[PDB]
From a paper:
Pyrococcus furiosus Hjm (PfuHjm) is a structure-specific DNA helicase that was originally identified by in vitro screening for Holliday junction migration activity. It belongs to helicase superfamily 2, and shares homology with the human DNA polymerase Θ (PolΘ), HEL308, and Drosophila Mus308 proteins, which are involved in DNA repair. Previous biochemical and genetic analyses revealed that PfuHjm preferentially binds to fork-related Y-structured DNAs and unwinds their double-stranded regions, suggesting that this helicase is a functional counterpart of the bacterial RecQ helicase, which is essential for genome maintenance. PfuHjm folds into five domains (domains 1 to 5) with dimensions of approximately 70 × 50 × 30 Å.
Residue numbers in the entry: 1 to 331, 336 to 556, 564 to 664
The structure:
């Protein structure tokens, strides 16, 4: 299909041409002629390499232009939002307002009412709906990217919830990877189903086993070692992407590869890779990233700061970096994609990476511009080669299961309905359930109903809600406030129960430990080695905490380690020193800090709700200290367009 055969305003055809696009891939055309341009819902299940995002932009803009209103683009993580924001800029050339909303859960954000295209994570949008933002009624279409994450135990329930709220109120467009139950999800969505595996560049998938790669077609190719695939790819001017399961693993493998890749890097690239390694902020975690990069290979994982990760990502794109070793969470295309591990550590033991995931990983092979073929190789270190092939190259992807039973999401969601959506009867809350994907999969209805009755009891006991002998459920201040803060009802419960202790002794350690013990935060882990030190410091500072005795406990000390880290953060300990002293990386530090700000904020708000107004100012000063990791006497110099503990501290001196 030629962009000009597209029955849409010239403004869109014009913007695409400027983009170099003149025609659509067969999968794109099928999607564009399925009814999405006429408002129908649709579920697009095709390779990422086939431009799922373009089908969404076109249907969004066409939607707005033909009927005013706004378009919502829901993104998986508040990090794939800035990239969606950059690529959605060219829509402003035709007068479209593109906004990005990610955090700050406690606000209606009425300022978004003047934008046409809004990008947000599922959580952020879920809370906007709770706050009842004025403009939401103007949303005419919502696009959910990687909609298949609805099957994620963690946050899939949130995505399901907002989708359940929006179905039949706006056009819904889902973008997903291949899954086992495409038609079931499409039906629940009352959507057109577009399933395809057509891709621009041919994809050859194989398995590397003891000196050889066996491709799906049947042929065999010798390779002395899996790493040789990388080396070969690099010698051939192409690049390589290698997936691993652990951070340190990614780090060991990156440094390793780089030790033999450097002898393939012309003077320019080595010269450049050095100007590159020297630009990295200084800290342990980067020192490593440094050595590897000067060698041409880099590692990529959550333990690295946002910037570092961006620097890697783009330079791999720029091609200045020949290969990047990365973990899954937070993972451009490459000629060769190597999956070096097929077993990952879960709390359920070491398990095999899901099929849906391996496919998504192999699908990143083959750059439209530079390749006549893309190759994805799974490395079988100690698995039956044939079994690996049959399970990951010829096995149906997993079927998506509603993750609505996730007790933490459900408890927070049952209250949200009562406290911000006016549900007042169990039977009415059940009506909501009936429109969810859980209800549509006809999954165990009884068990869900009982978990909800129990949850209502929990909420009724802790005074978030109230009931009548007529059984009319109505929310109370703490209920409404909790729901609007987006925190788990249980962390609110934990704040409420300890509010007397906090006002009796307001202090950093106590608070950080308290918040780091709730469900809304993932405390730092600790090893067998340091645990010794943690115990002494604990018993040395048990007076400042708000809990009697851990025993009378793993999370307790994780939270306690976290309380110490944050404490050093507010006391301006240099990043690098914190990384060292507590064995933690700047990625987790920024993540935890950012979450602590949110959580110390929510404690202030819950304090307001419970009369403890005398600690409000303190917690407020604590919130700001946590956000920038600074002493109070610097909070003024924080205003600036940008500075931080960085210069600020020096300035003040």
């Amino acid at each position: 299909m030629r962009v000009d055969e597209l029955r849409v305003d010239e403004r869109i055809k014009s913007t695409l041409k400027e983009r170099g696009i003149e025609s659509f891939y067969p999968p794109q055309a099928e999607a564009l002629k399925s009814g999405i341009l006429e408002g129908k819902n649709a579920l697009i299940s095709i390779p990422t390499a086939s431009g799922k995002t373009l089908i969404a932009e076109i249907a969004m803009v066409h939607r707005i232009l033909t009927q005013g209103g706004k378009a919502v683009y829901i993104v998986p993580l508040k990090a794939l939002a800035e990239e969606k924001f950059q690529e959605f800029q060219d829509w402003e050339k035709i007068g479209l307002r593109v906004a990005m909303a990610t955090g700050d859960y406690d606000s209606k954000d009425e300022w978004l009412g003047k934008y046409d295209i809004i990008i947000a994570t599922a959580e952020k949008f879920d809370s906007l709906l709770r706050h009842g933002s004025s403009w939401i009624k103007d949303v005419k279409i919502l696009v959910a990217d990687e909609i298949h994450l609805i099957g994620s135990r963690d946050r899939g329930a949130t995505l399901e919830v907002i989708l359940a709220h929006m179905l039949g109120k706006a056009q819904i467009i889902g973008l997903s990877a291949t899954i086992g139950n495409p038609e079931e999800l499409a039906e629940w969505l009352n959507a057109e189903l577009i399933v395809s595996d057509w891709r621009p560049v041919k994809l050859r998938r194989g398995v590397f086993y003891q000196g050889f790669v066996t491709w799906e077609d049947g042929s065999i190719d010798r390779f002395s070692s899996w790493e040789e695939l990388v080396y070969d790819a690099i010698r051939k001017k192409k690049g390589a992407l290698i997936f691993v399961n652990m951070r340190r693993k990614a780090e060991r493998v990156a440094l390793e590869l780089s030790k033999k890749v450097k002898s393939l890097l012309t003077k320019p690239e080595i010269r450049a890779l050095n100007e590159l390694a020297d630009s990295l902020e200084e800290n342990p975690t980067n020192e490593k990233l440094a050595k590897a990069i000067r060698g041409g290979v880099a590692f990529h994982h959550a333990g690295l700061g946002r910037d570092e990760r961006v620097l890697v990502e783009e330079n791999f794109r720029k091609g200045i970096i020949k290969a990047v070793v990365a973990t899954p969470t937070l993972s451009t295309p490459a000629f060769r994609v190597i999956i070096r591990d097929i077993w990952r550590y879960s709390d359920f033991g070491m398990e095999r990476i899901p099929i849906i995931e391996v496919h998504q990983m192999l699908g990143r092979a083959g750059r439209p511009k530079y390749d006549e073929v893309g190759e994805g190789i799974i490395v079988s270190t100690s698995d039956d080669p044939r079994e690996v092939m049959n399970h990951y190259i010829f096995g149906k992807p997993e079927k998506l299961f509603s993750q609505l039973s996730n007790e933490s999401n459900l408890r927070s969601q049952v209250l949200a309905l009562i406290a911000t959506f006016g549900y007042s009867t169990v039977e009415e809350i059940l009506k909501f359930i009936s429109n969810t994907f859980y209800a549509y999969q006809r999954k165990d209805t009884y068990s869900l109903e009982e978990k909800i009755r129990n949850i209502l009891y929990f909420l009724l006991e802790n005074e978030f809600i109230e009931i009548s002998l007529e059984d009319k459920i109505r929310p109370l201040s703490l209920g409404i406030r909790t729901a609007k803060l987006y925190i788990d009802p249980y962390t609110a419960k934990m704040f409420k129960d300890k509010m007397e202790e906090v006002v009796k002794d307001p202090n950093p350690i106590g608070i950080f430990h308290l918040i780091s013990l709730t469900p809304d935060i993932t405390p730092f882990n600790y090893s067998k080695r340091e645990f010794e030190r943690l115990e002494e410091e604990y018993y040395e500072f048990k007076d400042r905490l708000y809990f009697d005795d851990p025993y009378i406990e793993r999370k307790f000390f994780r939270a306690f380690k976290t309380a110490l880290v944050l404490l050093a953060w507010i006391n301006e300990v240099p990043e690098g020193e914190i990384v060292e002293k507590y064995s933690v990386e700047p990625g987790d530090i920024y993540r935890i800090v950012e979450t602590a700000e949110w959580l110390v904020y929510s404690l202030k708000e819950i304090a307001k709700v419970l009369g403890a107004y005398e600690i409000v100012d303190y917690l407020e000063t604590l919130r700001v200290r946590v956000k920038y990791g600074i002493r109070e006497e610097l909070i003024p110099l924080m205003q600036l367009p940008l500075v931080g503990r960085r210069r600020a501290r020096a300035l003040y001196n």
